[PDB]
Design goal:
This is part of a larger assembly, with 2 copies of chain A. The first copy, chain A, is mostly loops. Helices cover 8% and strands 0% of the residues of chain A.
Chain lengths: 49, 17
C-alpha cells in the first residue's frame, strides 16, 4: 500500500502512514533491485527482522 | 492519533474486562 501506489504526495506535504499490528519480512526490499538508494542508519538492516 | 483499528430478555451476555 505504501509501495504499489499509482501516485505519491509532495515533499513538503509528505504522506505519513502509522503502521502497527502487521507482519513484514523485509526480504523483498533486499530482493528488489529497482531501489536506487537503500540507506539504513539506526539499526543494521540485516538483523532487523 | 489512531494507533490501532479492527473491523469484524432471552440473551444473557457476560463480559469481563
Amino acid at each position: 500500500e505504501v509501495f504499489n501506489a499509482t501516485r505519491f504526495a509532495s515533499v513538503y506535504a509528505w504522506n505519513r502512514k502509522r503502521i502497527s499490528n502487521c507482519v513484514a519480512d523485509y526480504s523483498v526490499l533486499y530482493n528488489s533491485a529497482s531501489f536506487s538508494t537503500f540507506k539504513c542508519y539506526g539499526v543494521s538492516p540485516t538483523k532487523l527482522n | 492519533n489512531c494507533t490501532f483499528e479492527y473491523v469484524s430478555f432471552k440473551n444473557l451476555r457476560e463480559f469481563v474486562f
